């Protein structure tokens, strides 16, 4: 354990104590650690890019972190610091280990019970708020799915970006047949035509469906990438039950999951709808 160095702030691992690993990406590892300077629990994202990029290629990764560090919102995981030492990239993030959306979904599956619409909007609207914040600053998420959706003990949603280090894996798309979860990807992402803001909307719609159905709209048994892509391109997926969810919810999903890349709603639209729906089913 290195001695504490308060004068260097959060720009060294000497000021943090790792207690355990909490997750793993393909370009990075995620550790649970406490800050030795102030006792605050943090998430440490360790990125190993030195075996992939040289000093020049590495520069492409600067813009992404500098931009992400500008975010500031109660429903977004906060960035505190980033630095390089011991030939490793270290990013300090707000910790949200209380639980996540994935765990919530698994819980409902075990109970053989669907999530009440009033409980779907409860979390969905918060996610939408976080995305509005990002998009208004021209920041794309690019990996929206339950894995990155964290829920606090108080039921507050915080959107993280851990993913698989997608911000670094920008020029190695050949590996994305194995790296990534192409259930939340729009046809445009599948075709590698570029990721636009409306593609976050696609993935957001997918998430909403999944919560309501307790399963991805493009899920299937022993479904390969070929068939999966075809179902996505054809926007072919089962409807939500008419007596369990409102028409408005289904319409929101239908608008978000649109195989035509130019016909998706923006985040503001979706957020306003989520607010108006929530406002009618918002328990006090």
């Amino acid at each position: 354990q290195k001695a504490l160095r308060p004068d260097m702030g959060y720009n060294t691992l000497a000021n943090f104590r790792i207690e355990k690993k909490i997750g793993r990406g393909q370009f990075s590892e995620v550790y649970r650690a406490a800050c030795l300077l102030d006792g605050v629990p943090v998430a440490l994202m360790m990125v190993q890019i030195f075996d992939l990029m040289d000093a020049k290629a590495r520069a492409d990764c600067i813009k992404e972190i500098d931009l992400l560090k500008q975010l500031n919102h109660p429903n977004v995981i906060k960035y505190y610091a980033s630095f390089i030492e011991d030939n490793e990239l270290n990013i300090v993030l707000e910790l949200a280990d209380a639980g996540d959306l994935s765990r919530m979904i698994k819980h409902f599956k075990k109970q053989k019970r669907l999530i009440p619409e009033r409980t779907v909007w409860k979390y969905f609207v918060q996610l939408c708020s976080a995305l509005e914040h990002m998009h208004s600053r021209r920041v794309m998420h690019r990996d929206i799915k339950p894995a990155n959706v964290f829920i606090t003990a108080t039921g507050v949603v915080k959107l993280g970006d851990l993913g698989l280090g997608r911000f670094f894996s920008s020029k190695t798309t050949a590996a994305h047949s194995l790296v990534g979860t192409p259930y939340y990807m729009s046809p445009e992402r599948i075709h590698e035509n570029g990721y636009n803001f409306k593609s976050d909307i696609w993935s957001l719609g997918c998430l909403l469906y999944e919560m309501a159905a307790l399963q991805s709209p493009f899920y299937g048994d022993k479904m390969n990438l070929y068939s999966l892509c075809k179902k996505i391109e054809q926007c072919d997926y089962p409807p939500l039950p008419s007596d369990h969810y409102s028409e408005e919810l289904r319409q929101l999903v239908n608008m978000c999951i649109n195989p035509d890349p130019e016909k998706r709603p923006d985040v503001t639209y979706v957020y306003d709808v989520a607010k108006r729906m929530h406002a009618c089913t918002a328990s006090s």
Binding site: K110, A147, S177, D221, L225, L249, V273
Partner: protein, 816 residues
Amino acid sequence: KKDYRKKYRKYVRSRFQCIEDRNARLGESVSLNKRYTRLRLIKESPIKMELLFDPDDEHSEPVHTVVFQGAAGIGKTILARKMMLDWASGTLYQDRFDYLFYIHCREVSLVTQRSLGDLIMSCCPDPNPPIHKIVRKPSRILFLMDGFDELQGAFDEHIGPLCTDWQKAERGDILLSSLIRKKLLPEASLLITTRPVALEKLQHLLDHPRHVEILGFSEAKRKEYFFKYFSDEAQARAAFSLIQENEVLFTMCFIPLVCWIVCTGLKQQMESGKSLAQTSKTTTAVYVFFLSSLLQPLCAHLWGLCSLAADGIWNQKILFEESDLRNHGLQKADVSAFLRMNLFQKEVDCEKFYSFIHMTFQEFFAAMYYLLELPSRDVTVLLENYGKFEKGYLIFVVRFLFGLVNQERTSYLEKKLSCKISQQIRLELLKWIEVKAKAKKLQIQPSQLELFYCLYEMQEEDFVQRAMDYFPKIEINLSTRMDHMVSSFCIENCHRVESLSLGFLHNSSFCRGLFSVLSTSQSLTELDLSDNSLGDPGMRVLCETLQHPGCNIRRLWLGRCGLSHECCFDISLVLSSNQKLVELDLSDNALGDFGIRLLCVGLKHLLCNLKKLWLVSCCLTSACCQDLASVLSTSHSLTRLYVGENALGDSGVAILCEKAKNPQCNLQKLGLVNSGLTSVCCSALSSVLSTNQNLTHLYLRGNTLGDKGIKLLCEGLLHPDCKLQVLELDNCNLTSHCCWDLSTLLTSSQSLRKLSLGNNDLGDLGVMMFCEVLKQQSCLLQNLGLSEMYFNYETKSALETLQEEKPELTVVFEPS
């Protein structure tokens, strides 16, 4: 050397001196703006009329647009009128805005073209105001557009030619949209008041609105209204005593329009020397009562009025001229009769048009039209257009139709209605309900609760009891007392509901009624009260009703309800006598060790038939396992126990295991998920697995057993008496080192059906090992997890090969 702001403020003060907004105010009386009773305002602490446009809590984001919403009769327009006056008087926003422009939605065309002259039409008498001067400057002005839902004619949101530049004339819909979207005179402020139904076509135009709900009168305010309305306290007391006796009407009087109608009716009864009887129960009854009292003292003109009202709805007309009145056979004597009687207004505010005192009355008359003895007179077309903005949604037209179509008919003009038609309508309405009941809607026009309101109005048991057969699942979101009353009525008469979902909103220990009704239901099976503020006081009331002999509740869901340890006392009391309850979910509450200790009493108690108990995230520690373990030993009825997401470490589990181990325990499932367990606990688990043959599903996901834990657990699982079928091992901090033991398990055990391996470093070799060995006549039927794992090509190929070669493994699951 004169300004315009002063001239306008004087004009505004002058025009808004009366609530009635006209002359001929019941004998040319003064409305008295002091008559105004404060309405409750709740921000999406109370919110004031002032500071509505103020910047928010962080980054000081300013508000240009404020949208108010509320039910018709609440006072959306009176609030705006009060606002106009308080400003003109220099008390409200007198520093913030130089001009306010109040525009009625019913007075603006959506079909004709014009420049933004609305700011001129609404200005002082001066026909040529300094519109191009300071009045032109955005942000110094606020527009007030009330009655968005009262807009007449079709309206679209998808307008390309939005049109800026107020000097340019364009179609009214475009002009309105441009104002709403803040494209025309941007940075100007805008206040909108609308019925919730019209939000469907408004929210798309707001961008970044602030929302406030307008609520009706409180009990105290209802009393004030009566005493302020009746200047003679002797009369006010009589009127107040009468409303107190008629509790149902009192509840409805939360809507100012309703209390006005009642007070107006009583005033007439007082003047006429009548007994002041008031026996109305429903909204329709109130409107019928009013019309009867006013007009009965006739049908020749009533029929004509009904025709006019119906035409106005279908032709989107609110303001009628003398030529329209003549077209319906209405002229001179009757028109006058309905001005001396407060049924119609003459729109004296710079207009020559006649209109209804309230839009609800227009809908009432239009509803009446269909039942008498000509836009249609058809009911099918009426119902088909129920969801259409373009027809005004027809909400009251249909709601009144339900109330009017009854077998319990009365006299006084009502004798004019045709029973033949009434019978035809009744049948059509039942078919309509069957259809609308099949597809939930929240903010459309049908809305589940709305159907209940319709059933409430039609106070006929045969009809309602039949209608209720189409609601196997009832989901409601109650707000006010009126909603609780209506819901109680509809549910009480329902004999075919299995699932009740109550999304209780806001404005606890008053609910009663509904719970009293639910406990007497014969078909209700599942009661879902999760994710709402059912704090202990509410749980206590519910528990009292849950002890009723006829409850018949099989499942009770009480998740994140904010319950504390105290509620377990009352729950225990239910368990001790309610022999019907099978599954109870108390997850996501603060039912710590003390709370559960109390629950254990109810669980141990004889005749407790509870089989499934969920205690996830209940702030429990290993300390409570001492009592819970006794429950497992003592209670033969409890078979499913989920206690994950608590502080139940290895010592907690060992306690539970010591008793669960006993082969006479009936425990079948253990939700020992995020318990923070290590390989140490596997000794205790092994003993249970090798002993208790009633255990079929064991959930250990979320723990950190490692390979050592797997080996120890396997020793138990590999025992010939282990009957475990499903094992869940999500991220258990496993490595490829454990694949040998898992491999051994896969080709050794016989009772195992599913091995769920989640996010752990099993390795590529681990999976390939599994593929080779699982082929050797495995007994496994289900998948092997392998989610959130990264595999190389050869590994993926080998896994896919397995999937194809051994189809008996219905599911295997690759992460790709």
